[PDB]
Amino acid sequence: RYSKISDNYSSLLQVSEALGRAGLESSNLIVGIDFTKSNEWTGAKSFNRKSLHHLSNTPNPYEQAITIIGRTLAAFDEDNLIPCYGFGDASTHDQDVFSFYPEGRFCNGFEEVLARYREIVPQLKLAGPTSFAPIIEMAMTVVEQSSGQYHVLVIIADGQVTRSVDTEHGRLSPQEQKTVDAIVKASTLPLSIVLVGVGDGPWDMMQEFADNIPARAFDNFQFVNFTEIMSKNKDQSRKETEFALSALMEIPPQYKATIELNLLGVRNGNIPQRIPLPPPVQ
């Protein structure tokens, strides 16, 4: 379905224009980056056996994903301030996020996101396990503190939420419990959540995962497999529009739903204030 749409899109400008015509207005971008140790080996097939966070003269999947989404959403934020966080390194595990800059200062444009990313990466101790509760709660806090301005949180991760050892008997892990709770609670705010999967995964359980999130006032969650799209036999420009469309096509209807539900522009009042840790660098 997204492949059919993308056959008519040769540039990310066209995709931005389409989001606008579909009714997307002012949108702020929030980025969260997975810094788990698994990144070392999930690039087996998808990244020629290199770490997903390997730095070189060609962008790694994190840099690519940031670049495509950042470029596509740029038109919807006049000054492109991007709150950016890491999670899953030794300083945060599954409990916290850290801000890219001290005192939680926002990045000025995706270009600075990318530059700061490259500075931080070699200084991190990669760890785990995997929960998206902290990054989503951080996004919730930013949205509340902005007085209900519309935000898109983009999480780029190399694995599904950590499961229980006893998942076969229906047991959820605390990572799953807290992440699903956060997704549901986030739907009380004008916030869209896009989970971008990079690396080899596996990612086969994601559509079932999304299908099983409890009922919400609007569907505020999307998963997109960057790896699968970017592995296809298309021109580079057309793989990028397909990825941008698969990640962001559902954002204009979600935006319109936040207006219909009168979430836009107001404080919910029941959002605990998550504090981002400092970047574990120097």
Closest contact distance (angstroms) between CB of 3 and Mg ion is: 27
E runs forming strands in 52-108: 81-82, 84-87, 98-99, 107-108
Closest contact distance (angstroms) between CB of 126 and Mg ion is: 8
Q: What is the DSSP letter of 106?
A: P
Q: Which is nearer to Mg ion, 36 or 131 (CB)?
A: 36
Q: Which is nearer to Mg ion, 83 or 279 (CB)?
A: 83
Q: Which is nearer to Mg ion, 26 or 237 (CB)?
A: 26
Q: What is the DSSP letter of 204?
A: T
Count Cβ atoms below 10 Å from residue 94 Cβ, excluding itself: 22
Closest contact distance (angstroms) between CB of 131 and Mg ion is: 11
E runs forming strands in the chain: 28-34, 81-82, 84-87, 98-99, 107-108, 151-157, 191-197, 221-225
What is the Cα–Cα distance from 263 to 39, expressed in whole angstroms?
37
Closest contact distance (angstroms) between CB of 38 and Mg ion is: 3
* Token digits of residue 22: 């579909």
What is the Cα–Cα distance from 268 to 185, expressed in whole angstroms?
11
Closest contact distance (angstroms) between CB of 160 and Mg ion is: 9
Q: What strands lie across the sheet with 191-197, from one edge to the other?
A: 98-99, 84-87, 28-34, 151-157, 191-197, 221-225
Binding residues for Mg ion, per CB under 5 A?
36, 38, 77, 79, 81, 158-159
Closest contact distance (angstroms) between CB of 236 and Mg ion is: 26
124 forms beta bridges with none
